[PDB]
Structure formats: C-alpha cells, structure tokens
Design a protein around this ligand. Structure first.
Ligand SMILES: Cc1cc2nc3c(=O)[nH]c(=O)nc-3n(C[C@H](O)[C@H](O)[C@H](O)COP(=O)(O)OP(=O)(O)OC[C@H]3O[C@@H](n4cnc5c(N)ncnc54)[C@H](O)[C@@H]3O)c2cc1C
Ligand SMILES: Cc1cc2nc3c(=O)[nH]c(=O)nc-3n(C[C@H](O)[C@H](O)[C@H](O)COP(=O)(O)OP(=O)(O)OC[C@H]3O[C@@H](n4cnc5c(N)ncnc54)[C@H](O)[C@@H]3O)c2cc1C
Lengths: 606, 604
C-alpha cells in the first residue's frame, strides 16, 4: 500500500518521552492499560495500511459524482468499502464518551490512533467524524437534545459543520443565513452555505447532522449575533431514531478540487426548494460562535494531525525509494568514471533532504502529541504537574501551531519527499504528488494560516496575558539549563531568545497602535513569520528532549533496531538545531525592522 | 479573458530601460529589427498567448493525451492542436531561428521574452514547437550533407526530441546502455529503451520527428566520454527532396501519467525493439555526443527556468486581480469594531506581504533570465556590458544553473503564496493556480535536478572556471553598492555569499587530505545556489529601483509612475525581508559537519 506508518515513533513519544502510560489503568482510564493501548495502535496501523489505504488512489482517480436532481453524491465503491472497514472496527468512535459507546482514553492516544487513518486516506476520517460531532452536540445540548445526540452517535450518523458562505469565509460574522422562529419553538433556516465538507455522503449513513450557524431575525451583527442549529438531513423519531421525512437542506453543487477529491465539498442550500430547513437551537440558547468553536477546535487539531500524518508517509516513501535507487558514484569518487554506482542515500544532498523530512515529520508528531497531553486535565497533571486552567490555556496556545505551522510545514517539506524520487516523483504511479495535492488544502480550511497567526498572537498570547506562552518558555529554559547536547542547548537558547525578541517587537507595535493606529499593520506583517518561528522552536526543543531520552536508552545498552531508532533521534535533534534554528535570528532581525512602506504603497503599483 | 496574464510592460522595462538591449537593434546581425518592431512583436505574441494558446490550457490538463497501443502513437486533445496551429501559422516557432533556416535574427534577450508568453499560457505548446531550434543545433553540428537534412527538417517544421534518459541512467547520463552498431553502409542501428522522453510522439501535429539520441557505439569507453549522438528520424525520408518514406524503428510504448504538464506527452521510447531497425546517422560523423548534446541541454535549461518564471508571473497577476476584488473583513485598524466597513483584502497586511513577495520574486526572476540572456550574444554582451566573447560565455554558463535551479525552486515555492491569496477558492480547479503548481513541480526535476544544477554551478561553473565569471558578477554588484539602506543590505548579502563560497571551497580543497570533507560541499551546495539567486534578485531589483527613481524625478506620470513606484517598493521589501536570511545561511554553511553522513542508513 501507499501508506507507511510509524507506530514505533508514536509509542516512543507516548510512553518513553511523555509518560502517558502513567494515567493508563487509573481513574478515567481504569479499564485501558499500556499493553492494550499498544495493541490498538498496531491494529489501526495495520487496518490503515491495508483496507483503508487500498482506496486512496481510487478516491482521487474516480472521484465522487453529483446528481443535481437528487441532490446526492455517489462515492466510488472501493472507498465505501474502506469506510465500512473503519466502521466495522469501531474506529469512528475513538475516544468517544463511554455513555455514547466509546472507549475512554487519553486524547494523546486518540490522536495517535487517528493519525493512521489520516495518513492512509484522510477523507475517510473526515466522513467518520459524525460520532465525535454528536458528542459535541450532546455536551452543548438540552436534556432532550442529549437523547438525540445519543441516537446519532449510536447509529453512526454523519455530521457537518456549516458556517461558510460565498461572502463570509474568514469573516464568519458577515454570514447572512437567517433563522426564522416558529411558534412551536423550532426555527426555519434560510440561506446558501459553501465549501461544506461531507454535506452529502452517498449511502454511508442513515442520516447526517448539520450543525448550522445562522442569524436569528433581528439579531445583532457579527459573530456575536450568530446562533447554532441542529439541522438533520432527515427528520426522525426523537424517541426511537426512526428516520422520517426529508428536511429542507439540499446539496446544490460539489466542487472540483486540486486534491482531497473523495471528500465531497458542497454548496448547501437551506430552505430554497419549497421545503423548510427545520433547525433546533443548540442548547436552546443563543451562543453560536462559542458553541461552534468546540467543533472548530477539534477540526484544527484534525487538520494539523492530517498534515503531519501525510508528511510522515511521504518521508517514509521517499526513504524506501532512496535506499533502493542506484544512481551515480560516491562523491569521494566523482572524478573516477569507473567507480561503483551507489544507492542515492550515499549522496549528501539526499541525506540532507531525508534528514530535513525526518526531523520535521518527527518534530511535528511530537508537537501534536505534546499538545494533546494538555487536552485531558488528568494527563496534564500526571505528565506535567499542570492544573486544569493552565492546561486549557496551553492547549489553546498550541492549537494554531498544530494547525498553522503543521499545515504549512508538511506541504513545504513534501517538496523534498517528491524531489528524492527524481523524475519518478512527478508520476502518479507514486503517491507523493497526491500527498502534495491533498495537503495543499490544510493551509486554507478551518481558518487560513493568516487567521491562525492572528488568533495565536491576539487571542492566545495577548488576551491570555502571556500565561501559557510563559509556561512553555519556562519549560524550554529548564531544558536548556539542565554534556553531550551542549551545542544543541546553546542553539536552543539562541532560538528561545530570538522568539522572545519577536514577541516583544510585535507587542511593541501593538502598544504603538495606541498612538498611531497604522502601527498595528506591523503586527499583521510579522504574524505568520512569528507563528512559524514558534513552531520551529518547539520542534527543536521537543526533538532535543527526544534526543536526551534516546541518549539514556543508548547508554543503558539498546541494541539492534532500537539502537538505530535512538541514533536517528539524536541525529535529527542535532541536524534541526544546526540547520533550522539559526534562521530564527535573521527572522527576528527582520521582524524588528518591519515598516509600513508596503502598506502605504498605492494598490496600482503592485 | 484567458487564465494567462502577461507582463509586456515589465519585459520592455528590462530590455530597454535597464539593460539597453535596444542599443544593438538596427545594427549588424539585427540591422533589420528596430526597437519599435521588437515592442510590437512582444505585444503581438502576448496577445497570441492570452488568446488561442491559453485557450486550451485547461483542456490539455482535463482531457490529457492518450497512448494507442494499436498504432504506437499518442493522440492529443483537439483544442490543444488548434493552439499549436495558431503558433505555427503565426510563424512563432522560428523566432531567433537562423536566417538561412527562415528565422528572424534577434537578440536572445528578446527571443526569451517572446517565448516567456508561450510558456506562461500553455508551456507544452512551446515544447512541441522546439523542433526548428533543435534542427538548427543539428545543422550546426552536422556534416555538409547533414546540414541539408537539417534545413529540410527546420523548413518543414518537423518535431524533435532529446533522447538521453534510461530507467537506470537519469542524473548519471554516463551509465546509459543504449547501443549503436555501425552498419556496412555507414549508418548505425540503435538498440535500447529510453524513458521520460518529451514529445516522443505528437499525434498528427507534424509529418516527421527528429530524435536526437545518445547511444554508446559498440566498443566505446564507459563514461559520458563514450557516448555519441545520432540523428534518428521517426520516418525515413529522401535526403534531397524531403519526401517522407518508410517508418523507422523508433516507437513510443507508453505515456506517463503525471502530476501536471499533462498535455506534454512524456514517453518511453523503444529503439529497434519492434523488429525493424532504428537507423541513426552519426551527428557530424564524429564521436562527440555529450559535447554535442549539451548544446541542446543548455537551451532546455534556459527554457525550464523561463517557464518557471513565466508561470509564477501569471500566478501572481491572477492572485493580485482576485485580491483587488475580494471583500473580506474590516481594516486591521478597526478590528475591534464589528460594525466597521468591510474592505478588499489588499488592505490586509498579510495579503500585502504575500503579494509583494510574489511580485518581488516574479520580477527579480524575470530580470535574472533577461540579464543572463544579455550574455548569450557576443554583440549584446559587448554593447550592454563591455564584456568580450570569452567572458560573456563563461558568465552565461555561470548563470544558467541559477535560471534553471533557482528559478524552478522559487516559482513553485512562491506560487504557494499565490494560491493562498485566493483562500479556499485557490484549491478549486475553477482557478488556474492549482494547475500552475502541478505544472511547475516538474521544473525542479527534468533537465537536471536542483542538486545537479547546484553541483554544476559550484564544481564546473565556479571551481573549474577558477572563479572568473563569479568574480565579474560580484564586481558588478560591488560597483552598484559603491537607495542607501538597500545598498547596505546588499553589501551584507554579498559578503554572506562570499563567505559561503569561501567555506565550500575550503571543504572541497581539504578533501585531498580528508576525502569525506567533500561531502560538506554536497550538503551546502543547493543552499549556496539559492543564496546566489536571492543576491542576484536583490541586486537587479535595486538596479531597477535606481532606474525607477531616475524616471520619477524626470516627471513620470500615470500608469508609468505607479509602475516605477512598485519597483522601488519591491527592491526595498526584498532587501529588508529576503536578503538578511543569507546571514544565517552563511553561518549554517560555515558550521556544516559530517554527522549526517556518518549516521547508519538504518537510523533514518
Ligand atoms: C516530465 C519529464 C520529462 C522528461 N523529458 C526528458 C526528455 O525529453 N529527454 C531527456 O533526456 N530526459 C528527460 N527527462 C529526464 C530528466 O532529464 C532527468 O534527468 C530525470 O528525470 C532525472 O533522473 P531520474 O528520474 O532517474 O532521477 P535520479 O537521477 O534517480 O535522481 C533521484 C534523486 O537522487 C538525486 N541524485 C542522483 N544522483 C545524484 C548525485 N550524484 N548527487 C546528488 N544527488 C543525486 C537526485 O537529485 C534526485 O533527488 C524528463 C523527466 C521528466 C520528469
Ligand atoms: C476544501 C474545503 C472544505 C471546507 N469545508 C468547510 C466546512 O465543512 N464547513 C465550513 O464552515 N467551512 C468549510 N470551508 C471553508 C473554509 O473555512 C474557508 O475556505 C476559509 O475559512 C477561507 O475562506 P474564503 O475561502 O472565503 O477565503 P477569504 O476569507 O476570502 O480569504 C482570502 C485571502 O484573504 C486573507 N484574509 C481574509 N481576511 C483576512 C484578515 N482579516 N486578515 C488577514 N488576511 C485575511 C486570507 O488569509 C486569504 O489569503 C472549507 C474550505 C475548503 C477549501
């Protein structure tokens, strides 16, 4: 199959670096032990490498077909077979609450399991997000709505998040879809939404729960005026779940995309076909953007994990290719035109490329798993000694890194993966060109990189009063202040100071905006580079932490494949510190010298 | 209009206001081509590109070529063939062609500016039209008798291919195993399978195809040194009249399914395997293949770089047009006010950052390939630079890997910004940027990968050259440095690149005592190539800004004034936001070690 997994690195992170096994068999996870967690990782990785990856090519080459008269999509049969393999193993219920039929587990294990589906066929996981979205509806719902959410989860209904409109993408608060209150307390939703993932899904599911943002008639402007509504594809019996009459919510177009083709990306028309789109106000309160961000937070974690998953299998495909491809002589024998030909892993530029791919893939894996350790209060306490409030703020700080830095990094470093194959990398015979096309969406949906970087600075640092950022910086400082990693710790110290300098510069521009409003533009100009710098710093630190563990295991006497694995962690941490981190010094100097010339330029001059 | 957005204004600015190529127009080789006619030609081909050539850009990708095993041919979509006919009917496939082959003499700088439009609109169309130019290369390398066949080939507009690559010989051309067996009559029978051959068949576009095939005569030595070049036509023909005769034994056997550039048929080509012989004629009746074939490789490397730049330019201009109309969000100065007016996204800082990044690299790359082309005519190099023919050739050789390697990497990377500017809509096939990205990814791979470009640049174009071309260009940068802030930033960048060159040269020279030292050259080579590209971009943009300042002081108005204002802004932005990174890259190159080379392969 195309999909090459890395359970070994996952288990290294979960158990040898972060110690998530400390909570297994205790309190919420009393019924899940470490051996079982490992077995589940191996099991889903095998399922991903087999039946799920089997339709990865098919979904792209034979993409979904829309019938505009039935407002339905037909998915390729091979992809539906992969979906059934996912459902038959219960993998659309990973980490679902126990009362909804799930297996309780730390979020760090949950996302490690999901990584394999996202690497093998990411749209398959997207289609399978229904039960998790039903749990969010449960948590935000009235007692009666919790009964519907239980049905939806138990029956495996699909689900969507429905926000975007043609004129309201990044600016969610500009949305014009309306909600009209009915005497009996239901609402009729009227509007056209766009770019809705999974808004129809062929016959995968008995029903779909649309979670729709809409503006009640007479509500105020902006996101504050928006409410969230449960809008099912089919009406249903609220006691038994029996599916009833079709609700007035119809797909009216399916986009032709660069990649992720098997994910139906839809225009969704509500109340436009002479049938009301009945919706129920979630929680029977008007609090839409707050409620919908429970969904957005999960989707941003998913997109980041998808990016990392895809870079990982891209790297491992490139590595396998490089080990076998014979081309050229060793550089030490270039002059000799009779020298033996060698496999291309002998060439310095190929080893540079591979170690770049490796270090970023493994640094990103460490980042999303680190982030997830703050998503359970019990895990954050056991592994970090951090209380619930701080853990939540740290998770909030890291999500735009997982999403924003992960999405940008994975796409960029897949360029190196493709390059490693030479001309063959341009062929559809190999999976890397599809990885690139499928990953380009990651920087765009669930909030563009610029929106992630604005969220990160203004909301996760400034509004947070820097508490979460100071916590993470303190952990990096402690690592620095703890022989064989001295050069790496010195390089990390410089990188930490560089990022601190960037944060101070941008905060200074924000303060200056009290006096000259246009000074705020300099925050915008520097925001994305600052986000990427924090990502690089975290990557280098977590890689260096991994190298410290690897040194310990090597000193203790690791042999064989274990020894090679640990040796590679040391090499990745050292390579990243020496080749990636120093660039942050120049980025700091650039951010310190930002000016508004590019903002004052006449638009006609571009 | 079309997907293709051209930039004749920037081309003319470069050709005439910056480099002064008009100095040679109306004189000597170019006596019959004046400046007004050159401008009219650029405008005319730009309109052709925006019109009939671009018309089939989408069709070629969505309805790609089909291989027919019943006939060993490739079929092309009709709309694309209509674009090809528009190209030939206009006589565009003979721009810069030698006069005796029917061409219009012109400076290479003008030639590549004309070609940029075809490459931006539908680059495969130019590739299929490379026949006459390759026939001229055959003419130049051929016997007196062969010159007669090359004249027929160019006159009749035959297609042509360059046939080097094999399944086990890609970057390592010298490992090729395709064989040539001399026949009693002095012809050769070619036997082997070649891979990834562009335009290996082309439907009914042409009456014949000239394959220029590298092969190893029986008993020849092992290296590239042992390869010879052969003229292998698809059809035999009458060497005097050109009448097409019997099929020659050279057949396409598959067409590759590619990420992009789909309408360019990329084929496995089998010689002498469908048992009629592939008859070939030794080019020039001498054994000198790799030297002869590099005449073709040099033009192909210029083409790939120009293609990448052309595609980034139309990607940028599409993103700019979109950004000017897309209303989204309030101005950042009104972020708190959820009642503030919505603005077009060009008002947002990250979008202006993105657009200026795209602009500066697109225009810097255009300046680089036009600057390079000014060294490709001795008469232009003398007129515009005061540089003799020998130095001009060495400087052109130095810059070709920058055009190809730095251009290919840069265009693909900065198209990411172009797509991002469209938001979610950038991921749609409704807009052309996703196809630009797919079509552009090949540029870093064929006609020599980036790593091969960087190794050529350093080992051959610098070390073997004893740094003569490099010192000349560095001297011109230093003279400009001697726009004060931009000149200070350029001074730092020049010193940075000089430090990189010194470090890598040390690693290479130390290899005599410590063989593994050479690996550090390999580790740093691509970063060094890219740093040189960034330095050249920043220098040429600053040179453009100096001209722009002059024209503004002289009273420029209207659209001219806006253009010149944009050049000042691009040069300043590039100097302040791109060049400083070269300082960290220098320190990284100065710190290279062989830990990554000593690591066990199993540890990756
Ligand atoms: C679409 C397409 C069309 C083409 N059309 C033609 C054509 O018409 N005619 C033609 O002659 N060729 C053609 N080619 C081939 C092209 O010229 C390239 O040389 C070829 O694709 C690269 O060789 P390869 O694919 O075997 O990669 P390899 O040579 O196997 O390279 C694989 C990897 O190893 C690296 N590598 C290899 N050797 C070294 C070394 N010594 N030092 C450092 N790194 C090294 C490369 O950089 C690359 O990352 C085409 C290629 C493509 C993709
Ligand atoms: C494949 C796909 C699937 C999707 N699925 C869903 C789904 O299921 N549900 C859903 O609700 N949405 C979905 N979306 C919508 C997605 O969230 C939007 O595409 C995204 O938020 C960007 O919106 P837009 O496309 O309108 O771009 P715009 O908002 O128009 O952005 C255009 C450009 O302007 C920039 N920009 C805009 N505002 C600002 C600002 N204030 N500051 C700085 N820069 C700014 C952006 O960064 C971008 O570069 C999907 C999108 C895609 C591509």
């Amino acid at each position: 199959s195309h999909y090459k997994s890395n359970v070994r690195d996952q288990v290294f992170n979960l158990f040898e670096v972060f110690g998530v096994d400390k909570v297994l068999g205790a309190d919420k996870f009393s019924d899940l032990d470490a051996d079982t967690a490992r077995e589940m990782l191996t099991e889903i990785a095998r399922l991903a490498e087999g039946p799920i990856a089997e339709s990865f090519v098919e979904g792209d080459r034979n993409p979904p077909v829309f019938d505009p008269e039935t407002h339905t999509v037909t998915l390729p049969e091979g992809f539906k077979k992969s979906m059934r393999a996912l459902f038959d193993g219960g993998w659309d219920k990973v980490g679902l609450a126990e009362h909804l039929g799930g297996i309780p587990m730390p979020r760090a294990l949950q996302w490690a399991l999901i990584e394999h589906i996202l690497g093998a066929n990411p749209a398959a996981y997207m289609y399978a997000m229904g039960p998790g979205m039903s749990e969010i509806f449960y948590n935000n719902g009235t007692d009666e709505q919790k009964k519907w959410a239980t049905i939806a989860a138990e029956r495996g209904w699909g689900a969507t998040m429905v926000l975007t409109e043609p004129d309201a993408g990044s600016d969610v608060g500009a949305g014009r879809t309306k909600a009209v209150q009915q005497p009996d307390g239901t609402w009729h939703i009227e509007g056209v939404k766009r770019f809705i993932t999974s808004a129809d899904s062929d016959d995968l599911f008995e029903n779909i729960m649309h979670l729709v943002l809409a503006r009640p008639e007479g509500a105020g402007p902006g996101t504050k005026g928006l409410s969230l509504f449960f809008v099912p594809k089919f009406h249903f019996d609220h006691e038994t779940g029996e599916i009833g009459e079709r609700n007035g919510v119809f797909v009216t177009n399916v986009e032709h995309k660069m990649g992720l083709k098997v994910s139906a990306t839809c225009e969704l028309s509500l109340g436009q076909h002479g049938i009301p789109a009945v919706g129920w106000l979630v929680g029977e309160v008007h609090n839409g953007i707050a409620q919908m961000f429970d969904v957005i937070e999960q989707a941003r974690m998913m997109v980041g994990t998808k990016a990392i998953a895809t870079l990982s299998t891209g790297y491992l495909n490139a590595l396998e290719y490089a080990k076998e491809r014979v081309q050229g002589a060793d550089m030490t024998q270039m002059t000799d035109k009779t020298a033996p030909r060698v496999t291309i892993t002998h060439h310095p530029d190929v080893r540079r490329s591979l170690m770049t791919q490796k270090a970023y893939a493994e640094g990103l894996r460490a980042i999303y798993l680190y982030t997830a350790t703050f998503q359970d209060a019990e895990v954050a306490q056991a592994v970090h000694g951090v209380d619930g409030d701080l853990a939540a703020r740290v998770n909030d700080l890291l999500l735009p890194i997982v999403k924003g830095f992960g999405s940008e990094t994975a796409y960029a470093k897949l360029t190196e993966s493709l390059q490693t194959l030479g001309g063959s990398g341009f062929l559809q015979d190999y999976p890397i060109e599809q990885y690139i096309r499928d990953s380009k969406i990651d920087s765009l949906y669930e909030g563009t990189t610029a929106i992630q970087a604005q969220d990160f600075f203004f909301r996760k640092i400034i509004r947070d009063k820097g508490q979460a950022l100071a916590y993470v910086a303190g952990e990096i400082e402690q690592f620095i202040k703890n022989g064989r990693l001295k050069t790496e710790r010195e390089l990390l110290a410089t990188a930490l100071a560089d990022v601190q300098g960037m944060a101070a510069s941008l905060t200074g521009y924000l303060m200056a905006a009290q006096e000259d409003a246009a000074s705020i533009y300099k925050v915008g100009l520097g925001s994305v580079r600052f986000l990427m710098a924090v990502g690089d710093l975290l990557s280098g630190w977590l890689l260096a932490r991994q190298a410290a563990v690897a040194i310990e295991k090597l000193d203790a006497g690791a042999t064989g494949a274990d020894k090679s694995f640990y040796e590679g962690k040391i090499a990745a941490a050292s390579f990243f510190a020496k080749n990636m981190l120093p660039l942050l010094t120049s980025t700091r100097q650039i951010i310190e010298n930002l000016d508004n010339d590019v903002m004052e330029l006449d638009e006609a001059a571009f």
